[PDB]
Amino acid sequence: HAGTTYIFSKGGGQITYKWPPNDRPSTRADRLAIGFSTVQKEAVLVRVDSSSGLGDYLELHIHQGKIGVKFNVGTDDIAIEESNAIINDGKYHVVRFTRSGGNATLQVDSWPVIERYPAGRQLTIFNSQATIIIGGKEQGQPFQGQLSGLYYNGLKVLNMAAENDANIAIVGNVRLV
Amino acid sequence: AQYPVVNTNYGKIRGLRTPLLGPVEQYLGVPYASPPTGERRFQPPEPPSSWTGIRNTTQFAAVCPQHLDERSLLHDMLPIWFTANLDTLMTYVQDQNEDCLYLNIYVPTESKKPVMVYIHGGSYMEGTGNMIDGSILASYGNVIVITINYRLGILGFLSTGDQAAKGNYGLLDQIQALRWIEENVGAFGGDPKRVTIFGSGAGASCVSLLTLSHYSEGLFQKAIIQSGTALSSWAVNYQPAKYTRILADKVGCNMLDTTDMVECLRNKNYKELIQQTITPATYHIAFGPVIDGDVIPDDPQILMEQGEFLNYDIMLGVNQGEGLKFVDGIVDNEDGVTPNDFDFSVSNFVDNLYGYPEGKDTLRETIKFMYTDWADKENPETRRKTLVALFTDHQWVAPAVATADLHAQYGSPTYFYAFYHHCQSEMKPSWADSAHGDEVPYVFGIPMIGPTELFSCNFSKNDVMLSAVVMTYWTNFAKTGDPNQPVVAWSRYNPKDQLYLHIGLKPRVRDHYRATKVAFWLELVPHLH
Ligand SMILES: *[C@@H]1O[C@H](CO)[C@@H](O)[C@H](O)[C@H]1NC(C)=O
Ligand SMILES: *[C@@H]1O[C@H](CO)[C@@H](O)[C@H](O)[C@H]1NC(C)=O
Ligand SMILES: [Ca+2]
Ligand SMILES: [Cl-]
Ligand SMILES: [Cl-]
C-alpha cells in the first residue's frame, strides 16, 4: 500500500466525489485503477454513476473472492472478471481496468490481462458522470479493508479526499490511515 | 507595439494593432494547413509548412473558390443580409484561390484568455470568415476571436459514396484549424482549455456535426449553435454519388470507375468545376457534409437519440421569422397573403418535403388547420405570418428543440434562446420579423461601430444595448459555460421545464417554445406515415 490509504471498518463507510453539475464528463474510453486489501468474499469497492435518469454506470466489485468490473454504457451490462487470482486474502493487490467503448481490459497484479469483447453492436459513450462512490454502502455491499492509489480518468480521488476537496463527502466508518 | 509579432510553432508572424474598448491585435491570413492543391484536392488537410524569419499576416489571404450566381445560389438557405447585399458581397470573394486554408485572429490588448472560433456559412457553397470582423467581440468580451476559411462546395464536400472520395474535406478543414488553435493559441495569450466554437446557419450545422465526431475530442469544450442544426433537410447530403456523377459527366469525366473518375476530376481546372449548375432537390444540398462512417459515423438523428457525443456546454437558438423567404412572391400591396396562395404554398411544401403518394391530402389539410389562426382567420397579414411560421418551425425550430432536448437528456449543460429582435433596414420588408441571419450583427457588436456595407442598418441606442447584452451572454458562456457568469438570469434548459430566453428589447425567461407546433412536426406528422 503506497501513499494515501483509507481503512474501512465494521459497519461500513463511504467516500463520495460529486462532479460539479456544470462539468460531468462523458467518455468514450475509461481507465480505473486501485490498490486494496480485504478478507471479504463480497463487496462493492468503487462505483461511477451517471446522472439520475440515465442507466450508465461502472462498478468495481468482489464476488466469491474474485475481483471484477461490471459496466453499462447504453446497450447491456458487460462483465469482466479475474476469475483465478484469489484477492480476498488480506494481502495488498492492484487492479487495473480499461474500457474502450463496449470493450474492456482487467488485470490483477502481474497476472495476464483479461480482455472482454462483447458480441453485436455496442454503444460507446458513458454519459454525464455524476458521482464516484467508494465503499459500497449504497449498493448494499459495504467494503471492509484498505484502499489506496485510486485513479479514475486522471482523478487521484483518494488524495482529493485527503486534501478536503469541496466536492468530497466522507461518511461512516472510514479512517485516513 | 504597432506591428506585433508572435512566434507560432511554424515561425513568427507579424500582425496589426488596430483601435476601435481597448485596441485589438489582428493577425490576418494565417495559414493553418498546407494548400489542398494538386494531389491533395479531395484529400484531408495536412499541417502547414514552417518558415524562418517573419511572415506578414496583415491582410486577408485569397478566399476559397466559389461562383456566386443568382440561379445557382441556394436562396432559401442563405441569410437575408447575404442575398440582400450580393453586389457588395461578391466584393469579399472576388479574389479566390484553391490555396485558401487561412484563419484570422483577433486578440484584445488589456493569465490566459478564452477563444471563440467562428464557423461561417450559408449553404456550404459560399462565403468567408473574413466578412466578420471579430475586433469588437474580442475587445468587448476580452476573448480571442478567430475566424476561418474552409474548403467550400465541390472542393470541400465532393463524395462518391465509396472510398474514392469520402467527402467532408471542409469539416476536416475546420478540425485542422481547431488543431492549429489548440497547439498555437497559447502563444497569443489564448487558453486551449477554453475554446468555444460557434456559427450561424450552415456554419451552425457544421458546429452540430462537429460535436458528433470523434475527431473533435479535446479540440473544444463549448459550442454556440445559431439558427441551424445537423437535422434539417439541408444539413446533410444523403445522395452524394448522384450529384458527383452529374458533375463528372458535365466536365467530361464519364469513366465508371469511381477511383479513375476522382483522379480525372482532380486534374480538372477548378474554375470549370464551379461554373457548372448542379441543382439539388428543393430544400436539399448537392454538395455538403455526408455520412462517411468515420468523420460523421452515422445519421445525426441516430447518434443523438443514442447519446453518442461527448459533454460539451451547449448554447443554441433560433430567430422569430427565420423563414421569411418562404413567402417570396405572394405578399400583396397590403402586406397580406390570399387563401389560394396559402393553399398553394402548403401544397408545394408537402410535395417538396413529404413527397409520398399517398397520405398527403390528409397532411396538407392538417398543416393548413394547424397554421390557421382560428381566432382571426380572415386577416391576410396573419396568414402571412403563419406561413413564415410554418417554414421557420419546420426547418429551424423543430430540429433545434429536438437537438436541445437530446443534449439536455444526456446531461450536457444546455441553454436555449428565441431571438426576437433585428435592425431597421431596407434589406428586408418592414413587416418582416427577425429573419435568417439577423442575430449576426448583435453577436459581433456591429452597432457599437455603425452601419457597414453588409449590414446597412439604421441603429438606435437600443440596438447598441441589445448587442451589449448578447455579447455579454455569449462571452460569459465562453468564459464559464454559463451565460450569467463572467467568473436577466438565463435559466438552464432541461426537457422537463424547457426554459429558454426570449431575447428582445425586454429579455425574459419563458418555457416550452412553440411546444405544440414542435410536437406537431416531431410527433404527429411522423405517425401519419
Ligand atoms: C509586412 O507589411 C508591412 C505593412 O506596412 C510592411 O511594412 C512590411 O515591410 C511587410 N513585411 C516585410 C517582411 O517586409
Ligand atoms: C433612421 O430612422 C430615422 C428616423 O426618422 C430616419 O431618418 C430613417 O428612417 C433612418 N435614417 C437613415 C439615415 O437612414
Ligand atoms: Ca451511453
Ligand atoms: Cl397558428
Ligand atoms: Cl405553440
Q: What Rg of chain A is obtained from the alpha carbons, in whole angstroms?
A: 15 Å
Order of helices and strands of chain B: EEEEEHHEEHEHHEHEHHHHEHHHEHHEEH
Q: Quaternary state, please?
A: heterodimer
Shape of chain A: globular
Number of helical segments with 4 or more residues of chain A: 1
CATH homologous superfamily classification of chain B: Alpha/Beta hydrolase fold, catalytic domain
* CATH architecture classification of chain B: 3-Layer(aba) Sandwich
Biggest pleated-sheet summary of chain A? 12 strands, antiparallel
Give the overall form of chain B. globular
Q: How many structural domains does the protein architecture of chain A include?
A: 1
Distance between the termini of chain B: 66 Å
Straight-line distance between termini of chain A? 11 Å
Helix content of chain A: under 10%
CATH topology tier name of chain A: Jelly Rolls
Number of helices of chain B: 16
Largest sheet data of chain B:
11 strands, mixed
Number of strands of chain A: 12
CATH domain class of chain B: Alpha Beta
Radius of gyration of chain B: 23 Å
Share of residues in strands of chain A? over 45%
PDB class: cell adhesion
Keywords: alpha-beta-hydrolase fold, autism, conformational rearrangement, cell adhesion
Assembly: dimeric
Entry title: Revisited crystal structure of Neurexin1beta-Neuroligin4 complex
